[model samples]
Target chain A: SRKFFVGGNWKMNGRKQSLGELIGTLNAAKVPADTEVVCAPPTAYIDFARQKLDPKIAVAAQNCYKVTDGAFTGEISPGMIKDCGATWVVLGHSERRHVFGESDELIGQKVAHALAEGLGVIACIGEKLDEREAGITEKVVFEQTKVIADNVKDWSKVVLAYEPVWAIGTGKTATPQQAQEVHEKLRGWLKSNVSDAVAQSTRIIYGGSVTGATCKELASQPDVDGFLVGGASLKPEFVDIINAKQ
Target chain B: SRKFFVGGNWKMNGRKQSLGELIGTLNAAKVPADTEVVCAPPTAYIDFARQKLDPKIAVAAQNCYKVTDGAFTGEISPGMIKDCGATWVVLGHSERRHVFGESDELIGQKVAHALAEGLGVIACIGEKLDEREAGITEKVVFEQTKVIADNVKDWSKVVLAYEPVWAIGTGKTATPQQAQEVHEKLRGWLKSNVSDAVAQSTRIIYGGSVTGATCKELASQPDVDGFLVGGASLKPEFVDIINAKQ
Candidate 1:
């Protein structure tokens, strides 16, 4: 069975003091050994979090540039993240896609380069409200997935996050059935289009409005292996979400 | 007299080892006490640079976002930068303009927000190759500078960098005369359009192919207060540029 994973995307939040408090909270929690926990603070706090957070938990960068190092102002690289002791990077986040205009092709290049530098990737892919309403969620998610699948040589270093754009920060979440439908379809697509090994081994996580109250039902979904949490991740309740699988 | 200042913009280069070496070089150099020296390494290395570099030289971030915190993924905020112990930020860089499509309005917002958060700003403005060829360098630079001037309430915390787009990274240094002509024009504009105090007090530094060899002549210009070094910043010669006025 694939390991149950939980990733907290702090998403442009947190100061040094709050990060310390969050780290303290995590350190005190009795996180299940069977589950893998990772938190992505903003790039500025990655090293600080890496040093202060529990050793059992992993740290991730919110985003990275395609190149290892160059003239791209305001961008960090996978090499820099790795040097900072972070092993994972969250790429193609919906905020990056909608707010910053990160195209699928660009995200593919970033994923390819990040993996090349030996960093694991939490590659986020999802459909917008319009696409879901139009009943083309499968097509949109598959196209997004195909770019990553085409560029990525190793599947093991990648975790897929299916975050419905409309649901993010809207206090709206996809029902467990809705999330399961997409996750199951994506797994099948990976199995048939990529390989069975990839489909079975890859962890397909859900995101968008995840909370402790809602996580138990979501965790019960067979194909919903984990979560890429947002707002609630900043709160103490994140501990409960991390222990949801327990 | 306006204080002579030298800022080294490392852009998107340097790793852990190279950064240590760069800091070592800076630490060993006899940086002129009279000149205000600042260096902007990539964001990933800012805190590391802050801790490792000599305390006399201030650390700067290559860029920052308009908001203090938010869901703008892959971006850093002024507060986050401040939290990293960075007091300065380089905004409106030509790379951000030409390469990344940062507009004047967006840059203005960033400058205002960064300054409001008590961070000093190295506000960069320059003409593209075509704008220079058309003899509209002054017009282009003023328009770029105007947006920031319109948005900013405090002029004391801002440093203006006139980096000609064609000269940056091209190894083609802007002649002393060319740099002075623009700096003089900008000073005059600031005097009339903003205020005499702002124009006279502001350190309108020169950028674009500034090197140890060319820096002396550039520093000699009546209007040129200092330099914003690029490629040479990553090398040992950056010390020579910092001490060019001495």
Candidate 2:
């Protein structure tokens, strides 16, 4: 089936008034009927997103804690995310790992927690600039994948996002060949580590400096399921990125 | 104009379902017409709170960043809070200062930033158990107050929450005498440092272990403007605390 899934991780941006305009533009536009679109907005805007978003276009939280509740002062639990009417949650984004100190183990916990709460997960994992330079991109990606593979029994609810930290918000686009190479290798790893059915059916998306202009070539790759956009997601080009496959 | 303002800091508790019920209860119940009520949900639930809350009862964020926006990954900003349709923000809670490593200087910075964005400030300041024990209650409270007084040019938009660190979440209530001492002292400090008008007009609410059983007596004190109930606010008894003034 390989239904294409394109997600926009707005990260830490957008104003209330501007978000209404952004959603209004999306709401009014005609997107590809076949493609599935989801947006992960900052926690403050998730409910508003839920209210304004087209039903087909689901809303997701950028990140959520594994623990359900109580005394973890600054955390928002996955259950809370589900209660807020969001059907999806993004786990293990590169910014969370590199900038906010979330570990692979913690990401696995979040994946399991989200699934337990009956929420779909766009589980993210990727190499850094140095890891890519060191030729350990495959190894690093596997380490992240293995954690989830070990912990999560049901893989149907998970979509993998390969976001190279170096390319994020830096305007350094990964060459189509570079992203495809990584995506192909990841698919192979999934085939060996998980079931062949999951390997073939699961989405392996790319993020980091993904613009509307670059999404087509990347999305065309056999293993590149779709694009998980960052900064470009906040702009008008996000609609274009959503229609990249078409 | 005895406009009583009550805020329930749902500090690090409640799953999504419980939060939904909490909101549902508030939505179904009848809040007094004369009083203003707001609940400070954790960042993730702020959106849900907005959706389910009575239009008359507003929503608030428990904490916010000093900067408007940037690469500070985990933190949400005051501008975003304002953008989220939240009209109020609570800053410098003892949990944030003592437990989370926020400094008075940082709280002062947040106050300035939050005010600049036109968001109301529920600025918290309180003495610890030891300081109150040592009879330096006035000195400790004064130091905390001085920072806000020095930075905030106008006091009309600010609400002071005197949550003594010792009395918070400990199941211990401050004696009415002890509570009034700090309340009266803060009133004097504002009168001498700011203006008579600010002192007369400003709201100095109490927090930490406040319950329905104790609220009426606390509310009777001339300087005790209102109650910032914690544990009791999450319960059905919260309605009684809100109506204590009546």
Candidate 3:
């Protein structure tokens, strides 16, 4: 049985004062006891989020640099994220890949860097709309995963998030069947390329327009373990998405 | 007479843990009572710098965005800086301008945005060695100044620092005459274009390779109001630069 994980990517949102209210709402809500929840607030709000959040609801950084620290201006490092009391760091999100020009190899390096620093990583991988349309979804995701699998030795410290680029924040969600295909294919890739235990035990989650209404059907899929939520994570509905299984 | 304002751009340096010792050094030193001092640490160290610095020494952010807050990933805003207790924001530093691709017009917009939020602006302007050699120094500096002058309503809230692009962090100190010449040119430009009060009252400081050994002579120039010490600001010699008048 897979432990349910629900991670929120508060991509580039929240002010210092408003973050308090958001965290308070999360605190008052009755989140599932079994579900492992983590919210990624803006870098400025991380300290406040960690302080306000219940110990059960851990916090994560939306993105972080691969380097430990240096003269890289305007970048926050994964190590720095860990030092700030954040246990998890989300890497290789499509926003980071397409919008910010981060390459697969670079994301792999960041994953390896985070793992080495003793931080758990929610490593994201997915095909774009074109690749999915072309029926090369498996090839694209495999390439993304292969970079990490080749470079990173510890698969135990990482969770995979599948967020199809086109569906993200578009109000267009991948159907349960469509999502299940990719998730199962990834599991099979891991089983054949790595180890059976690692494949079965590793959690592969879905993202890109996931909502409370759609989460249950997606969560019910055999290969779909959890979710990496985007905008929905910012609202009260996020609690419902997390409690979908219950 | 306008009080001198000195800012140290620590620029993508320091960590959460190391900030204690860094701030402790600033606390122990007898900073000049007359001069307003500020230190620009990386965003992660802003809270630490604020907590540990002597009351006489305030804090600034190296860079900030135009918006109050939004989904612009990895970018801190003026409001965020204010929330962190930073009163001053270093906008249009040469490193941010030339190296990082921040255009003068965009910097002018940022300046307008920052000032409207009541955050003091350390507006930097200067020419490269080639511009200096071609005798287009005044043209380049005024081009930068005119944009801000056109956009900003009042001049009192702005501190102008002339940092020659070639000299910054390059170990090449500008001669007193060289700095004074540019300072005189800026003062003349302000007097002719702006009001007499704006010319004299607006603090026009010098940066780029400013050090303890050269500060006293530069400080004596009527137009040279202060120094924006870069590499020297992190050292014990910073005290001497701050106290150059004495």
Candidate 4:
């Protein structure tokens, strides 16, 4: 019953000169009616993308601070994010978790505050290579997912993305069945831990090295509602992935 | 011989509708020709502020990441900051140090990268309430300052601010002499560690409860070249703070 959603996290990439062309391509592209698309540019270009991108597409902040306003230098708040016409925020991605050292506690607080301020949250969780290789993937994913689930007030406003660290850009593709294995397990966990209604309604998107070639099979997975495209999202292949449901 | 610089770190504050009026005030106000004024709106509005503010008044990013571009989500690089028309950046503020947990090593890398991208940096250093109470204020400030100094290729592109954490927004104020003491010591530190030429040319500003009333005396202090204003920078008094040298 959940709608398909496709997200493009531009992720610390893009220059104005090239981004102009990228936005131009997005403006001209057509997608299946069943999908909802959101693009996250760097915070510096959120306004630019919002002003130029097709209205069918939404803009998102890569990250935002929890507070409305304070002395946290270099941090943007959800209030400011909305003011720039961006309607969503991508939080707790593996890069934010591992590279930037954002704690589960902080990501939870960020999710709470972003929702509290009325922006949709793309709450991301994944298992690192060590944890995945340790055969504790379920344990790691459930714990990470729990932190995000506990902070969310409305399941509809949150998109739970499973972007396994070992699979992301590592050329170690997770076959459609492999992706479904985790997505199915997660839905079951939600059915048990959260409510069946939420489990059935929430969008569980896949994010990794999802390419134009593989998106079709990934889309076939019963539990994979859509995708949060990484590297492929920046390329022209993004449009094909967006229309994968067709 | 150093140019006076007044930077307003509108830290995690300001809404668009209200910021228009604030920028309007800045446009209408007159300031000493010798002073360089920069305003740091939230990153979402950096473009808006850059386009709206007078050319003489520069815009700055409150903070920026240390790379050209990559998978670092929720971060802006120096390249993006410059593309948005901001010519300067405020880095390593005490708030970034204490509240957000940015390390000295990270701040140093950020300073080096920002300078490499041809953007000026307002590097900050300070001691907390406990550190001041413990009488290790000099030890703390000097240690913090050393990291930033070690990363710079040129002093002309760097402005240093001594913001005592205990004094910022705590209803506690640093007397002009108290402010001067640190600025003088910092200049001396620069002379000893860097070149005497750089020491003389570098602007050592003060931050921490600086007000419209107190700015004139603070500006008169030999070592205090300018200010990196906090709360007072938001109100109409910011113009007075900017015109203090007159």
TM-score of chain B of 2: 0.95
- Find the 10 residues in a row with the least total lDDT in model 2 chain B: B66-75
Clashes of each: 0, 0, 0, 0
State the lDDT of candidate 3 residue by residue for B147-219, as single tens digits: 8787678887889999888665555657888888889889888889888889989898998677888889989
**Model 4 lDDT, residue A31, Cα:** 66
Give residue B155's error in model 1 in angstroms. 0.6
lDDT (tens digit, per residue) of candidate 1 on A124-196: 9999887887989989999999998988899988999998796755555678898898999999999989999
Rank by TM-score (best first): 4, 1, 3, 2
Residue-wise C-alpha lDDT for candidate 1, range B2-113, written one tens digit per residue: 9999999898888879989999989999877689999898887888899898889999999989998887767888998888888899999988888778899999999999
The local lDDT score (0 to 100) that residue B175 gets in candidate 4 is: 89
Q: After superposition, how far is residue B94 of candidate 4 from its true place, in Å?
A: 1.1
> DockQ (Cα-based) per candidate?
0.74, 0.38, 0.33, 0.82
Which residue pairs clash within candidate 3?
Answer: none
* Best-matching candidate per lDDT: 4
Q: Lowest-scoring 10 consecutive residues by lDDT in candidate 4 chain A?
A: A166-175
The TM-score values for the models, in the order shown, are 0.97, 0.80, 0.82, 0.98
Cα error, residue B214 of model 3, in Å, equals 3.7
Which numbered prediction scores highest in DockQ against the true structure? Answer: 4
Let me know the TM-score candidate 2 reaches against the reference structure: 0.80
Model 4: C-alpha RMSD to truth?
Answer: 1.3
Where's the lowest-lDDT run of ten residues in candidate 1 chain B?
A: B166-175
Per-residue lDDT tens digits for candidate 4, residues B155-240, read 88999989978776676667899889999999999999998998999999888787888889999999999999987778899999
Q: What is the C-alpha RMSD of each candidate to the true structure, in Å?
A: 1.5, 4.3, 3.8, 1.3
